[PDB]
Amino acid sequence: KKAGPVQVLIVKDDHSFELDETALNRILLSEAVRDKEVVAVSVAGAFRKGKSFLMDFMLRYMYNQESVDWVGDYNEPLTGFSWRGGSERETTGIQIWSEIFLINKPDGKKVAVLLMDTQGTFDSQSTLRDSATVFALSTMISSIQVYNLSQNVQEDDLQHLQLFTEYGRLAMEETFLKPFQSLIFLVRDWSFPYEFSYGADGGAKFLEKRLKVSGNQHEELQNVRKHIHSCFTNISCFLLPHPGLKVATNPNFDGKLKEIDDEFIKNLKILIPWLLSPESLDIKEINGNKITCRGLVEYFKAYIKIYQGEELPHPKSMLQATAEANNLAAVATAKDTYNKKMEEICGGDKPFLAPNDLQTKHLQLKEESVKLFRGVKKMGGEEFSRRYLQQLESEIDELYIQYIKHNDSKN
């Protein structure tokens, strides 16, 4: 029925990660949105840090682009669809919004925006692994990762980034492109507007001090500061102020808007567009290929097989995963091209085509669609690629078959 948060990936108590593929397919494989280039916005962070709360206002904005006052009526309590849904009942894992959002970039492109909520605990390793895995995945998939910290970017906050740098540096060498898109530090209750101002301007001078290496204090947090900037195309920071005390000292805050502090609402109002304004949306791209919702479904499947058991994958294994998904996505794109181009000539209905003619069109469009497959960059390497080549040839042969059926409907 109506939209709500659907728990697509969950961490099992046995330390294994189960991905509800079916729900993922309902959402991203729907015909309306399947073929759209995709923006994947994820918020990740500790439990009980104001994530859902924020993500509300992200929905309020998405369902109300037109409004100047999407934030809502001040004398009315906050209402609308809710990420908090059933109160937690909190478990490490990833939630996505049941409704994908369709939006036009300034250049007329109709993109799909996917909202991810990433919940995990960050305290004990047997509990960090899962979190760092959920975090890994979350970041791997997302085009935009907003990292939701409480009061400051702390060393332990920067620690969870360690897992990427190893994999980044590796991916970077093999692809010759930086591996991740945008990472955003969202500092939650900033209390030094006199040291750095709230919002992006100020958030950025803050992040520059915090990320600068060689307090001499840091240890192998040096390694992260050293390489963090090479792994991410862009890294930014937003200083968000305290919601006021009615919001902080209450669970499932049911108050009216006026209850929320003014400077929190002031700044919340620039923040959300900042992240999800049409100009600000960043299309997910791996290797320099833009990714399709269908395409994105491949990367889920691939990365999930990797994080099985307590042991975490080595960059090398992750890398190989990215190769699978990257290769698969090329198949779908090339097969889509063949399929859609064939549909004109063969016809959704009409008109008649002589058997030998269908033959000659098919194999040229098959050879040429295979060429496009070869054209796209492949993570793994030709040898690794070649197994997928066959798959594409085989998937096209079965599409050919289906098209002789249709063709052979002219008496």
Ligand SMILES: Nc1nc2c(ncn2[C@@H]2O[C@H](COP(=O)(O)OP(=O)(O)O)[C@@H](O)[C@H]2O)c(=O)[nH]1
């Ligand atoms: N101190 C503080 N508390 C907040 C903020 N935003 C929300 N809260 C409150 O903190 C509690 C946890 O927020 P919640 O939405 O459940 O975040 P989540 O549990 O991480 O998804 C809720 O009762 C909120 O009412 C914030 O920016 N600062």
Ligand SMILES: [Mg+2]
């Ligand atoms: Mg949440």
